[PDB]
Symmetry: C6
Subunit: 205 residues, 6 copies
Amino acid sequence: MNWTGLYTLLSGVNRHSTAIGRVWLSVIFIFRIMVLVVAAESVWGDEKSSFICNTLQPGCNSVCYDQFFPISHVRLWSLQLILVSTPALLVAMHVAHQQHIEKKMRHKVHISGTLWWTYVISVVFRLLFEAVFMYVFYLLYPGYAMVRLVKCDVYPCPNTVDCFVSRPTEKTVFTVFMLAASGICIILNVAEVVYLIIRACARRA
Amino acid sequence: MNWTGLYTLLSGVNRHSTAIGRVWLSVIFIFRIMVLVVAAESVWGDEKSSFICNTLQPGCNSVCYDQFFPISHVRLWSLQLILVSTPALLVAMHVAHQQHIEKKMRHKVHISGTLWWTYVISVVFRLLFEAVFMYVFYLLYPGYAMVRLVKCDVYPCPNTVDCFVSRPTEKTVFTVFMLAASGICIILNVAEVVYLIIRACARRA
Amino acid sequence: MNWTGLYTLLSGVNRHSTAIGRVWLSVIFIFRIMVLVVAAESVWGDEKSSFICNTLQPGCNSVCYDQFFPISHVRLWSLQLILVSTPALLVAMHVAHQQHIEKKMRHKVHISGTLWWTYVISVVFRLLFEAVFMYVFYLLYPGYAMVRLVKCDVYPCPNTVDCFVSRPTEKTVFTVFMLAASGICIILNVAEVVYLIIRACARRA
Amino acid sequence: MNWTGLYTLLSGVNRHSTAIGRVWLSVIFIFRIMVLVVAAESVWGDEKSSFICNTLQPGCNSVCYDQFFPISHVRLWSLQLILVSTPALLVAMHVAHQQHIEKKMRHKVHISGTLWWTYVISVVFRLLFEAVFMYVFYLLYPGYAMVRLVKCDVYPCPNTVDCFVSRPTEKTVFTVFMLAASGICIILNVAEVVYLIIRACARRA
Amino acid sequence: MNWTGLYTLLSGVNRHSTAIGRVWLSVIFIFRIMVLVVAAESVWGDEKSSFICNTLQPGCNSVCYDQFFPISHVRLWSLQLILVSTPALLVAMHVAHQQHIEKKMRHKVHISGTLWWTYVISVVFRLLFEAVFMYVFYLLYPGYAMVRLVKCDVYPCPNTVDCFVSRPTEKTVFTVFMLAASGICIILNVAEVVYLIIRACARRA
Amino acid sequence: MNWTGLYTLLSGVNRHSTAIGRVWLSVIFIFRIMVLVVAAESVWGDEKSSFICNTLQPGCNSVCYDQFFPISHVRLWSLQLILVSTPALLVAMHVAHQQHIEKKMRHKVHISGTLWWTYVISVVFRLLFEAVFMYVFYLLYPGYAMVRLVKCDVYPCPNTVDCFVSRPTEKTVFTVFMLAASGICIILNVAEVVYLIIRACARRA
Ligand SMILES: CC(C)CCC[C@@H](C)[C@H]1CC[C@H]2[C@@H]3CC=C4C[C@@H](O)CC[C@]4(C)[C@H]3CC[C@]12C
Ligand SMILES: CC(C)CCC[C@@H](C)[C@H]1CC[C@H]2[C@@H]3CC=C4C[C@@H](O)CC[C@]4(C)[C@H]3CC[C@]12C
Ligand SMILES: CC(C)CCC[C@@H](C)[C@H]1CC[C@H]2[C@@H]3CC=C4C[C@@H](O)CC[C@]4(C)[C@H]3CC[C@]12C
Ligand SMILES: CC(C)CCC[C@@H](C)[C@H]1CC[C@H]2[C@@H]3CC=C4C[C@@H](O)CC[C@]4(C)[C@H]3CC[C@]12C
Ligand SMILES: CC(C)CCC[C@@H](C)[C@H]1CC[C@H]2[C@@H]3CC=C4C[C@@H](O)CC[C@]4(C)[C@H]3CC[C@]12C
Ligand SMILES: CC(C)CCC[C@@H](C)[C@H]1CC[C@H]2[C@@H]3CC=C4C[C@@H](O)CC[C@]4(C)[C@H]3CC[C@]12C
């Protein structure tokens, strides 16, 4: 597991990506993966059982947890990580496939231009996915701090029982870490698009 | 774990598959595997215990869960993934075996034609398996949204107790993701069959 | 993890096995392993706790589960998989050992004949093990469908309490899959024996 | 993970071991490891909780389980596997060390003789360990069949409550498998010692 | 997994780091990782359930644990390990990227100087992160010894119930180990900065 | 995973260690690791829950377990294994670093002498750590046999309730195994120091 291998794997063997994607984006992906793993394995553990309510009627706890947490934070970050990693996977497979096609046997200039457009559009899609997940996170959970207690009131629960959230401060810390990682990813993606466009326009002149 | 190795592994070292199977189908397989892993490990966890009913007679919960969920979604997707991956496995083993037979020592043209027919029939079988699992999913679970509560009524359960489903919205989200992945796989398989047939007929002329 | 490596590993580097064992038998072994893993990890989970009875006397549930399920299906398939995989392991080790002995330094014709007989006898033993496990499965569990409820009556259980089986339809589906895989393995083993004998007799003439 | 690598790893790169140790002993070790893994992971699971007694005084179940099962079967087989595998590990390390010493720079004949004696004594120790564990198994658990129920009577338990054993028939099956594997290992070890001594004496003449 | 590979991986292939970072810092990182793994897997296990209170009102235990342990020690050390490992990751990626850029085709002297400044600033950031986490640990948990029992008093808990901490002495031991590892890391980082600055100034003269 | 690789990895690529450390010490480390893994995974499982007391006041069990078992045996052996393995890790990193420094470009004689002193001092530290952990084990747990029942009397526990220890005989067996492994490690370390000193003094003459 040498460093050249890990760097090449995270780079995607893409000859158009600049140092922002080669170094900073890959590092932040590693950082976000590690934080997500820690949060998933420890903080949001059996989150169904951790979320407790002062009630005795069966099923009241389950409905309240679904009502106040339609999607748990880790699952949303898991989906976000998968979705934003998909265009990178597509670009890597495209590069590998083009290498294979070349290996079977100018047209190479056309291939390079196609790869350039593919990478730029992939970064734009990655930026859009990050922005969409950020907006979804804002829509589901206003603010950045985990709620401590909630006043649940739903059909299986009579008398408007109140429920408590396990590890609220710890979850707030990890929420800030994940949001910060996503925000910096957005900044880097915008920087890559601008840098590539500027360099391409300068080369055109 | 270089990208050439992963691309070759997912391709099956099949010289007749086009860029649709080399790139798009493999990527969607990776995407579907990751979503399934997340859903299996977190969303559909101890699904037997999550599905709860407001009753005290032992065994009522188990029978109700079996009555309304004959096959849980993850198991159906697990079987679907195994079944649709089987023809790809068969083609890969056929290619490896033909390479071995050649390595022991025109007939190679006949081998190439046999591989071509094998791949085309394998894609047709993969398409049929995807369609069958899609129809089974429609038959077992009408619609695309997880039911929130059900009115169970079976022998161990008196008085027609009602049961609640854990994480209904989250399960709906993953259901849509899995259905979308399966649908795009169907589209790509049809495209590969049409593309191969068109190219073969053009070559015949 | 290239395809040549996986194909060679499953083949056993046996120069007498035909395409049936190289391709079809190995694929079905992979398929059976995957289905067994899914069934073991999810379907037959904590099968002791899943099997429930409407009784309060401690130990009644344990005795009833032992009385109606002397050996759980997954353990039987696990033992079956180990036993039927053993002759393949023996042949692979024999081939490796013969290569080592040759590497230390006609007699090679005698070695080839010994390997031929070893492979044929190994396939016969594999067929016998499959048939024996099939008969044992028939003897323990008549039919192919998991029982839904049973009327247990044993010493710790008074009043002949009835017990329920968790996930009966899902277990039936996996039972059919495992039985089908075993049946096709039997067919392929018979085909290999017949094909080898026919080819050997033809070569004798 | 080629077959030559696995065969070499299990052989210990020992040039004095005959085909019995290269092939049959290694295969039985693999078989015993797999059966032990299955038994440990499934059959003897939370064996403390599975062993149940019809009593309410806390700690009675724990003392009864300790009183009738001083050492659980899997732990005894785990210790047996470790102990009988230790001399093989010692021989492998000795061979590697001798290769290293040779690599630093007849004396090689003396080295070969020392390796021969080391291997023979290691096999004798392996045979003794197998016999000792077999005798211990006989001493702790007379017979070969798991007891179904026991009549416990110890200080925390009043009124001589009776306890039940979970999965008795399944445990009996695995016990027979493990005992059979150990017995065949004893036979093979005796055969190796006799074969080596006979061949050495014949060479002396 | 040879020693040269592990040493190179932990070194980051950085040609400016001295023997302090190559040897001592990497060893302490390994030591800290192992201690953290042991503490996470065993000592701080289901820490939510281990922390118990003599009360019956649901949710009181959860709020008390959050009130006295806003962030559990393992999570804080996990975040600390990730944060202090990040600059090392950045330097490694920078070195790999510079090697790639060189591989595409004095400027190399400028590259070496940039790498030198990058490494020095990274060590300073690593030192600052260690100091910040040390101060946070002091702020959250005064002293170095785990509290045995606490007198919780919060809204869901009436009558000021008292709670007990599981494994206090064991947690104290691991706390001292982790604090000692962090302290020595601080000392080594300061030593590296001073050594590099002294050597650079001497070279300037 | 060839034997040369494993032997080299456990040796540390140290050219001054004799056959005692190359072969016997490495083997005993492997043996101790395996026994510790078995004990940790099975014997000392959820040791908090296994240790039970005949009481109903919450938290009494936790305090009693902490009072009679300040540090559980597996954690002590885990810390012991980490601590005694640390000097071996330091020597391996030193050798790798010296190889790297040599690779950058008599002084080699000075390097060899420094490595010799480093190894000797490391063995002395390893011996001291083993002796210290042995004394700590004696201090915490007099004797070698696990206590069966204890008479706990602490603040949360009224009336001096008695507690029982799960699997006392099994834990005694593993305790003897671990103590024996540590004792033989002490003997081998003393032998290595004496052998190296004797050989060095003889070479001086
Ligand atoms: C610059 C940054 C964003 C690059 C991100 C690249 C990441 C997302 C890529 C690089 C290598 C990829 C991995 C390569 C191989 C596998 C094995 C496969 O069986 C599951 C997916 C998995 C694990 C891939 C997931 C996506 C992955 C981790
Ligand atoms: C174009 C797409 C559909 C190709 C899909 C290829 C997938 C289904 C193939 C490619 C490599 C294959 C894997 C190769 C090796 C192994 C190891 C074996 O012990 C279990 C099965 C497993 C894990 C295979 C499962 C099927 C697999 C993942
Ligand atoms: C044609 C078909 C039936 C061939 C079947 C071959 C199977 C049964 C063989 C091929 C490779 C073998 C594996 C090779 C290596 C190991 C590692 C060892 O530590 C445990 C057993 C295990 C995992 C073997 C189990 C048996 C195995 C999986
Ligand atoms: C002929 C038969 C009896 C040979 C038996 C050889 C077995 C016992 C040997 C062969 C290879 C050995 C393994 C080689 C490497 C490791 C990694 C180490 O970190 C733990 C022990 C472990 C897993 C060894 C355990 C013992 C082992 C499995
Ligand atoms: C001198 C000391 C401080 C160097 C510390 C280097 C450590 C922090 C570096 C060296 C190798 C790195 C690992 C290399 C590869 C991977 C795989 C990736 O999928 C997750 C992160 C992970 C596991 C990295 C984490 C950070 C890591 C462990
Ligand atoms: C002669 C005897 C005492 C030598 C003992 C050497 C042992 C203690 C050394 C040899 C190889 C080392 C391992 C090499 C690589 C890694 C990976 C790292 O991410 C965690 C630590 C770990 C697992 C090391 C732990 C210490 C280790 C196991």
